[PDB]
């Protein structure tokens, strides 16, 4: 029923199964790790090969036991879709149609002040460095996972 390699789950019992089962050499396992079907395929970027079992060439074996996964994620630029302002803005342009820069005042100060607009991008959220992360964790529950080592 529980051959070597068997994952047992009891929920409310912290104890070693051999305590409550009276059997087996039991070891906690996969903690904070979900259990997903390891794909027999070599196709799956995830469940095909085992990250942990690598060869001399660092190549993952075709096996279960691959590990990974992330609880949360922070956003970076490359992930952000093309976006734009929601109104038109005066756009620094070499060849453009909006001509400007001709008028005196300067000294002479007697010339009244036209507001002098310069030339670069406007940063957005320059204070998030990095920004707040988002969690990757879907609804769950914590459970006492027991693999029988022997």
């Amino acid at each position: 029923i529980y051959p070597i390699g068997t994952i047992y789950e009891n929920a409310v019992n912290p104890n070693n199964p051999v305590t409550y089962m009276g059997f087996g050499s039991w070891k906690l396992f996969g903690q904070g790790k979900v259990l997903v079907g390891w794909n027999e395929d070599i196709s799956d970027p995830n469940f095909a090969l085992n990250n942990n079992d690598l060869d001399s060439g660092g190549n993952p074996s075709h096996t279960a036991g691959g590990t990974g996964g992330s609880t949360s994620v922070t956003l970076e630029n490359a992930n952000l879709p093309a976006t734009e302002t929601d109104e038109e803005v005066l756009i620094v342009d070499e060849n453009g149609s909006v001509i400007v820069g001709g008028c005196q005042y300067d000294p002479d100060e007697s010339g009244p002040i036209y507001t002098k607009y310069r030339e670069a991008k406007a940063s957005t959220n320059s204070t998030h460095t990095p920004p707040t992360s988002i969690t990757n964790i879907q609804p769950y529950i914590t459970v006492y996972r027991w693999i029988r080592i022997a």
Binding site: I42, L49, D55, S56, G57, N59, P60, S61, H62
Partner: protein, 288 residues
């Protein structure tokens, strides 16, 4: 298969001196059709059943070009030369019947998923002949590439020699070249980065400046990973200007130097041209 017309060009003697709309009303018909061939060539002609190659879903140009996928019903008609096709015979073995071609006429075809088998063969009729092929050539090869080229057209005779190639694999040679054996009588040649191959096979020919002494051996090497070595097997030895049945006209030594498999080819004879050519290699990847 979306049919293309040939190039169809606009009259400029029209327009400003003639009725604008009409002469243009015609021109679009050209232009529209004109790009069609273009995009139908380099994009899926099944995108014509779409917005007719228009919109973002429309046919796009592939600098690589596109191998046109279709039903067999369409290839049930002689298919014109110059076309790139991709068909997968998993459904069934097909004949691809080809028009009588011209000298230089090409027909490119592939099975991308490699579904081609004996259970999924591929028959071809290029009219009146295919060089080397009596009747219609059948293709059982997965991941093959069907390339026909009409090497004679003449009057009635469309002669198609035939090339076919595995669409994939490692086809490179890590080391091929030629040099002259130094006044030192030897050199060290990086062959490949020591990690690139578990096995390689190369052919060196050491020939005198006057060509009279030319050395040849059959080089089979086992790259030794852990020891950073390379194990050789030499045999089938052949010579011309050999003055001694012992090592003669040159010598062949091996090594791994600078993360390179490095052959050291030593000739007691000065002015020996040695051409180093690696004909075949092997490396181990993952299982499956």
């Amino acid at each position: 298969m979306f049919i293309q017309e040939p190039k169809k060009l606009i009259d400029t003697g029209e327009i400003g001196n003639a009725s604008t709309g009409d002469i243009l009303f015609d021109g679009g018909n050209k232009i529209n059709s004109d790009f069609n061939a273009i995009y139908n060539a380099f994009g899926d002609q099944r995108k014509m059943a779409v917005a007719n190659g228009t919109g973002a879903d429309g046919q796009i140009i592939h600098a690589t070009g596109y191998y046109q996928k279709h039903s067999i019903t369409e290839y049930a008609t002689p298919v014109k030369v110059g076309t790139r096709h991709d068909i997968d015979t998993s459904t069934v073995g097909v004949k691809v019947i080809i028009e009588r071609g011209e000298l230089g006429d090409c027909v490119e075809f592939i099975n991308s998923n490699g579904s081609i088998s004996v259970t999924n063969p591929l028959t071809i009729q290029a009219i009146d002949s295919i060089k080397g092929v009596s009747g219609n050539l059948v293709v059982t090869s997965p991941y093959s590439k069907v390339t026909l080229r009409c090497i004679s057209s003449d009057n009635s005779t469309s002669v198609w020699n035939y090339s076919i190639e595995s669409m994939f694999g490692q086809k490179e040679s890590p080391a091929e070249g030629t040099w002259n054996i130094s006044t030192s009588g030897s050199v060290d040649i990086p062959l490949f980065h020591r990690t690139e191959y578990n096995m390689a096979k190369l052919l060196v020919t050491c020939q005198s400046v006057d060509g009279r002494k030319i050395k040849t051996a059959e080089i089979n090497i086992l790259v030794d990973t852990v020891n950073s070595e390379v194990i050789s097997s030499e045999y089938a030895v052949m010579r011309v200007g050999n003055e001694t049945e012992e090592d003669e006209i040159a010598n062949i030594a091996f090594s791994i130097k600078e993360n390179y498999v490095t052959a050291t080819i030593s000739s007691s004879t000065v002015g020996m041209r040695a051409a180093v050519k690696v004909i075949a290699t092997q490396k181990i990847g993952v299982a499956q």
